[PDB]
């Protein structure tokens, strides 16, 4: 087969690292770690990474490399009835692209807004500011009334978001042309990065996957030298071992590691499908997973040095400084830090460029998974003319993201990020692991891995894939189902119909798998036993 291959091994490694290293490594993991015991949380995170995310990462990489097919078509070679998984994954991508890119747009907007001599989120003198605004790092002579807001909070909520113009999820308001242009530029960059395939995405990730680390090192050096950063680092690391007793800590570690590594989104599979057959996907999986986890740790150091600095300038514990987190931590809290620190313009420019790149590499990977899946599944129509299909994918993602550009767009972004990554994607990943372990047989998968690498996976990997990784995903799914999210943003309690809409989004993502199972059973003739067996067995070309 004349299939495309990575120009260089570094291209694949950096593509995977950029995929797994997103803004979640920077603002999800550190907040979750501090909330769940700080240093103690490194014990769940590690454990659920060793027996959880990493086995699935390696399994997906090996599967994609061996079968050299995308998310949709690969199930022809593993378990045909589960072909619907592919389509489900595609839908998930859309939902992700509906909000993911929007967040990047915000960063881009901030980036542009950060090119001024004085950062616009520095003072309360601006048009968007209201009477509640008060300088965050003001002298103690002026008290911080509970109703007060910081200038950066005003800039985020009223200038860029204009959230004040939306009464909630029911009244999103109009579309902000500024964010519309920002996301249009974002999608132009995305398209022109992933329109010729891996031969261009691999080269683009050289900048989009390494630059975030350069900026992270710069920001770590900046924060470590800030006054009061040691207190922030101590809060980050001070272990609350009692938190390990709570099940919620382990639940959060599981969810964080799964959604950080991203095993089960059809993206690692698509990236591996371009690897050379005999390439070592075991080493690649280990290297990329440890890189992602260490990036999460280092970015937590970066964030919490600054949080401790901010907690020192205000005589407050880091708990009040962090508040509630979200994008409201890199756009309000950290943005306040940049505004206060010297050389604020340069640090803001690099910080928001880092956010843009951290998002861009992951979006490249997420959309490339879908593009590869469709290209492999329907080559008779898309094998050529790939550029126009990628254009169609980008246009569809932009149209899906239009709702997130409204003045109530932040509410929709939070809704999607809470429900797009709900138990639907976890169930899809669990069914992937089950199909490749039980239905396809762990022995056959290990034989394929031996044929690729030359050595069969050890008993640890077999046990993980067969029992623990499916059990890991099932544990997360049960956690998500038996605890609905009471999600809240900007003192706006989400309504119950929003929860029902999130359930609808999740099922629409997942309802592809049962629908295709029923379709495949119906089409295949024979009795029910044969009707099922003939479709479980991988098709032989």
């Amino acid at each position, epitope marked *: 087969g004349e299939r495309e291959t990575w120009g260089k091994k570094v291209d694949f490694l950096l593509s995977v690292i950029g995929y797994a290293v997103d803004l979640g490594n920077v603002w999800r993991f550190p907040y979750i770690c501090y909330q769940n015991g700080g240093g103690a949380f490194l014990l769940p995170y590690t454990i659920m990474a060793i027996f959880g995310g990493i086995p699935l990462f390696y399994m997906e990489l090996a599967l994609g490399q061996y079968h050299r097919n995308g998310c949709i078509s690969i199930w022809r070679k593993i378990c045909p009835i589960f072909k619907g998984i592919g389509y489900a994954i595609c839908i998930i991508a859309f939902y992700i692209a509906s909000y993911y890119n929007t967040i990047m747009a915000w960063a881009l907007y901030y980036l542009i807004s950060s090119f001024t001599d004085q950062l616009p989120w520095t003072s309360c003198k601006n048009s*968007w500011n209201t009477g509640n605004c008060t300088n965050y790092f003001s002298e103690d002579n002026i008290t911080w009334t509970l109703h007060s807001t910081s200038p950066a909070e005003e800039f985020y909520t009223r200038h860029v978001l204009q959230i004040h113009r939306s009464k909630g999820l029911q009244d999103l308001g109009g579309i902000s042309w500024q964010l519309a242009l920002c996301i249009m530029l974002i999608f132009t960059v995305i398209y022109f990065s992933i329109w010729k395939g891996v031969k261009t995405s691999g080269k683009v990730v050289w900048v989009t996957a390494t630059f975030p680390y350069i900026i992270l090192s710069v920001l770590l050096v900046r924060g470590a030298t800030l006054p009061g950063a040691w207190r922030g680092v101590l809060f980050y690391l001070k272990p609350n071992w009692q938190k390990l007793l709570e099940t919620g800590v382990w639940i959060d570690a599981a969810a964080q590691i799964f959604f950080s590594l991203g095993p089960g989104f059809g993206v690692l599979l698509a990236f591996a499908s371009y690897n050379k057959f005999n390439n070592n996907c075991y080493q690649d999986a280990l290297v990329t997973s440890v890189v992602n986890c260490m990036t999460s740790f280092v970015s937590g150091f970066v964030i919490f040095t600054v949080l401790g600095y901010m907690a020192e300038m205000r005589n407050e514990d880091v708990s009040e400084v962090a508040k509630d987190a979200g994008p409201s931590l890199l756009f309000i809290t950290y943005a306040e830090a940049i505004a206060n620190m010297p050389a604020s313009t340069f640090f803001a420019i690099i910080f928001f460029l880092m956010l843009i790149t951290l998002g861009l590499d992951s979006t490249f990977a997420g959309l490339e998974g879908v593009i590869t899946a469709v290209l492999d599944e329907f080559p008779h129509v898309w094998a050529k003319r790939r550029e126009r299909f990628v254009l169609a994918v980008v246009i569809t993602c932009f149209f899906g993201s239009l709702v997130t550009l409204t003045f109530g767009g932040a509410y929709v972004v939070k809704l999607l990020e809470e429900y797009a990554t709900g138990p639907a994607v976890l169930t899809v990943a669990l069914i992937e692991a089950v199909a490749v372990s039980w239905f396809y047989g762990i022995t056959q998968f290990c034989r394929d891995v031996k044929e690729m690498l030359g050595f069969s996976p050890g008993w640890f990997w077999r046990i993980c894939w067969v029992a623990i990784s499916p059990l890991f995903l099932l544990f997360i799914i049960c956690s998500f189902l038996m605890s609905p999210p009471q999600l809240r943003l900007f003192q706006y309690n989400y309504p119950y119909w929003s929860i029902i809409l999130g359930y609808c989004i999740g099922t629409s993502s997942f309802i592809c798998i049962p629908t295709y199972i029923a379709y495949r059973l119906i089409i295949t003739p024979g009795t029910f036993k044969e009707r099922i067996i003939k479709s479980i067995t991988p098709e032989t070309p």
Partner: antibody
Amino acid sequence: QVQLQQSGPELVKLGASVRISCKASGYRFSYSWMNWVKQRPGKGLEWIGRIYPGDGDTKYSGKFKGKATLTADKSSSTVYMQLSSLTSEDSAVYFCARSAYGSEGFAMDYWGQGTSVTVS
Amino acid sequence: DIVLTQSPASLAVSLGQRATISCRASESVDNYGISFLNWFQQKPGQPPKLLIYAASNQGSGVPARFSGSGSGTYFSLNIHPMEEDDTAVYFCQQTKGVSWTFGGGTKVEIK
């Protein structure tokens, strides 16, 4: 009770410069633009400029830059205005206003009694 | 520089009738859902008094008879009933641009 107290009536000669003061009270002084507005004897209001004492950021009208310079003194909660190279045209009543906040359209809610500058 | 054109330059009202003063902005003054156009009243020989602190919002202590309306480039101030105490010069100030130019002023006098 917000009270903007301005200087008394001022009489100056041609080509001189004058210091017009506006003392603010009743509100947090550093977080409100202080607008200076001109009003000639027979003509309407004529915005001169504004100063944010918090950052000390002054923005002037196109025809008043250089002619008028605003400054702030947070210790005394005062806003000062230099009119330079005063001519017969500058003879007018000058008002200082609090400018409310951005959410309220920067409305100049509170005003001073006005300083009558007579150039002769 | 946003230019506010008021109309009419002078306006005569029979006592108790409705007074309407129109303002046209060369550029839209709306921003973040806030019109950024204010209406002020000035009695002869007194400092201007804030009248409407937005396109619509009533200035603190302003009687309910005064009412602002409009948005974008066109705004209006309406007085109903026009009491004898309302004879004054009504100005409109745009707080949108860098320079907050005042309006030409409308002299409302009792007929």
